[PDB]
Paper text:
To understand the molecular basis of the inactivation of dimeric EcHsp60, the crystal structure of the naïve EcHsp602 was solved at a resolution of 2.35 Å. The dimeric structure of the naïve EcHsp60 (EcHsp602) revealed a twofold symmetrical conformation, with two protomers facing each other in an asymmetric unit. The N-terminal (MIS and residues 1–87) and the C-terminal (residues 508–552) regions of both protomers were not observed in the density maps because of their disordered structure, and only a partial equatorial domain was built in this model. The equatorial domain of the naïve EcHsp602 showed greater flexibility compared with the apical domain, as indicated by a higher average b-factor. The α4 helix of each subunit protruded out from its equatorial domain to interact with the adjacent subunit, with the interface mainly composed of van der Waals forces and hydrophobic interactions. Two intermolecular polar contacts were identified on the α4 helix of each subunit, involving residues T89, E100, D103, R444, and D494. The RLK motif (R264-K266) located at the α9 terminus formed four hydrogen bonds with residues from another protomer, including E212, R264, L265, and K266. The T89 forms hydrogen bonds with D494, occupying the space of the ATP-binding pocket, and the D85, G86, and T87 are disordered, leading to the inability of EcHsp602 to hydrolyze ATP. In contrast, neither the naïve nor the mature EcHsp602 showed any ATP hydrolysis activity at any ATP concentration. The oligomeric conformation of the R264AK266A mutant was confirmed by negative-stain TEM, which showed that it formed a heptameric ring structure similar to the WT naïve EcHsp607. These results suggest that the RLK motif is crucial for stabilizing the dimeric form of EcHsp60.
Mitochondrial Hsp60 (mtHsp60) plays a crucial role in maintaining the proper folding of proteins in the mitochondria. mtHsp60 self-assembles into a ring-shaped heptamer, which can further form a double-ring tetradecamer in the presence of ATP and mtHsp10. The crystal structure of mtHsp60 reveals three domains: apical, intermediate, and equatorial domains. The equatorial domain connects the subunits in the heptameric ring and facilitates interactions between the two rings of tetradecamers. Our results showed that the E. coioides mtHsp60 (EcHsp60) forms dimers that are incapable of hydrolyzing ATP but can reassemble into heptamers, thus restoring ATPase activity.
Author numbering:
A (entry chain B): 114 to 479, 514 to 533
B (entry chain A): 115 to 479, 513 to 533
The structure:
Amino acid sequence: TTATVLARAIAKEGFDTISKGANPVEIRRGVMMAVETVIKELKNLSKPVTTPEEIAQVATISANGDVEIGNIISNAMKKVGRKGVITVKDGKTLHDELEIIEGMKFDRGYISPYFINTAKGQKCEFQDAYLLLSEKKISSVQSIVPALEIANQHRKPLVIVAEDVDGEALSTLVLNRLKVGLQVVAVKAPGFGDNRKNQLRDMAVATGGTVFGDEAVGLALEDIQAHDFGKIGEVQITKDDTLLLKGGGSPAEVEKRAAEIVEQLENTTSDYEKEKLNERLAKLSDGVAVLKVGGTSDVEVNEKKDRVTDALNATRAAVEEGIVPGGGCALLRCIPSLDAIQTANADQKIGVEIIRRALRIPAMTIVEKGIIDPTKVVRTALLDAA
Amino acid sequence: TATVLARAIAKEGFDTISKGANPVEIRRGVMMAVETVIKELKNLSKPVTTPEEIAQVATISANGDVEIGNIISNAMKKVGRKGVITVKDGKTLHDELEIIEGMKFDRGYISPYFINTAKGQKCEFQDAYLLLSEKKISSVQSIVPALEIANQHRKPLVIVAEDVDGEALSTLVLNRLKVGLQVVAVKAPGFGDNRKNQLRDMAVATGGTVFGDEAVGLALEDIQAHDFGKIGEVQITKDDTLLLKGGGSPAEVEKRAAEIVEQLENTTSDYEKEKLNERLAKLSDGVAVLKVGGTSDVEVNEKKDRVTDALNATRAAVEEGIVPGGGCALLRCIPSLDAIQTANADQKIGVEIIRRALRIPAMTIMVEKGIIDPTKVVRTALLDAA
């Protein structure tokens, strides 16, 4: 391990010699104060995107003036909402189609990247899958194998949603997926506290499944039967998101669940609890906008589907945090805000000066004319670079 | 835009911190010092040649485990200090040693999506087919008939070619990911005529045929089952490929070895003697298989990791020797830094960085429990810092 100690010294003593004994913690503090100040200024320059027109304008310039892509995006955002669920699919027709189907999305991705089965976009895509819902963590082999056996003997992919999947249970899932191509994926349950348990129950109703380990039934995972699984017509899991389309739950059961949420909505004075109940109610009642891209051939629609997805993600990022001048002009215009920064040391000065000098570089390398970048993209680009 | 920002922060960050120093001249001083240090390392190194010295190194790298040191030294007694040694799980209580036929070359899988074993990021197959090609593989229709033959015989397929790219690689990746197609692609080793010779050597060892060669010119589409090579066991990492128990007959292997020893006789080039001797060791010399036993699968997996670590440290020690004293040995290289002739103030800085870091490993003083340091591990760590 002499090699490991020697490498950490060259890195450590390399800073002290080059910087003439500067404090790295205070330099990092200078970078963080400058970055926070630039981002705060970025929120000032940003212009919101909420109106249907200015959404279409942003969506049009997001697709390089395709108009057809811009209008099919704004039309989807009209029928499903500014923050509604929109997904892109391959249409078998000549023109672009828009359809609203049953489904929902939540912000948790696959627990392991080995569950990837689609290199394009690094996603896990299944059709007609089983859904295993667990209110407790799944850590042991004994608690996950019976569910794998039933799914595998039915030749149905298996989506597992639990508080967490770790330990030997996760190792077993990765082993079978990698070694013998078992169609399986595991994701963490969204939310916290009772809201997490309620969201799990909502999935069971929407997909016709059962939640294991809940306080009510106390169903053991080793006693799983086939009908305990939920059913999903289509699954699409990325490293950040999970999309469940066309659940197997009957519309009557969905409606009774919406009635309980409506009852709780009139039984609380808390604004936060109402916010969570309304998010759950919308996930159950609202659908998913599906953009079916059409064209002349199967090779052309695949190329057009990508340009639609890229314009879709950029438009979604604009309705979130707004838009700023593109070409690096926004970062160049946040530089004078750094002169107001009150630091303590000369090392904090160095950190600010590093940001002050680097903000000109992206612009030096390069609204009504389409020269626009979304605020979210330019802000996260600065946080990750720093 | 995020990479430009990240590079701009690193570039302008070094300037602001170093008060306007030349990064090239500093790096030149770092590499100049590392060069002289490595010279003193090799002069000070002690070789590992004797069976007792090999076992001593393996025992210390096994935390004093004499049994692990014994089985590593025994494996080297049978296949030589530079022979191929692999580690496997054993079905008995103790460790076994088995000499089998096989070969290993320094080319890994073309895409990490071919991994089917998370532990060590490996692709492992048993009783597999081997497709060999002197030309690049790019089209799907060229490999589609080879795939159906492998699917009909229910055999994994290893593809060793000049390269596998284009739509052929993408559909191989897509089929592996989506439907669990057991396939892996590896670049052919060597260059020029030597690469053609090693490919033909692989065909003889496995009983297959090289497609697209200059002698026959067999097309990939005219493939028949007997054109495949047969391998008993395949282990492919990101850097290496191990083919065990090839299906070639002993007679054709003896003939191929007779051609190499004939060319070995009529050559004076030490580099060509090395190239032909490397080919002869692959075709003739055997592979040592260490089967690690235990009373439980947890103990076997744990012991297999310690045997692998001790083996890697022993192989590194056999190649370049061991460092006597470990950290204290780097102290004898510091006086050699005082003779380096620097040019500009930034070059003296780079030398001073190394002079500071070398003093540390001894200043801190595993070492009390007895550890050795292979000269290769220390040398590569110094080069990786410059």
